[PDB]
Homo-oligomer: A and B are copies of this chain.
Amino acid sequence: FAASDPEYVDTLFREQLLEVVMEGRELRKVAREASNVINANTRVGDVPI
């Protein structure tokens, strides 16, 4: 009509894109504190009971 943003929104500037990317859902990670951790030397093995 006059020059206005809604008309020229891709022609005379680009929309701002915020430089920070916003995180998704973050799961609770507890196994390493909540159990005994065996760093095994082999992929298969046994523990004596």
Contacts and interface: CB of A to CB of B under 8 A. Distances in A.
Contacts of A43: 5
A21 interface: yes
21 contacts: A5-B42, A14-B42, A15-B44, A15-B45, A15-B46, A16-B41, A16-B44, A16-B45, A16-B46, A17-B45, A17-B46, A17-B47, A17-B48, A18-B45, A18-B47, A20-B48, A21-B48, A22-B47, A22-B48, A22-B49, A24-B49
- One complex includes copies of this chain to the number of 2
A31 interface: no
Interface of A: 5, 9, 13-18, 20-22, 24, 38, 40-49
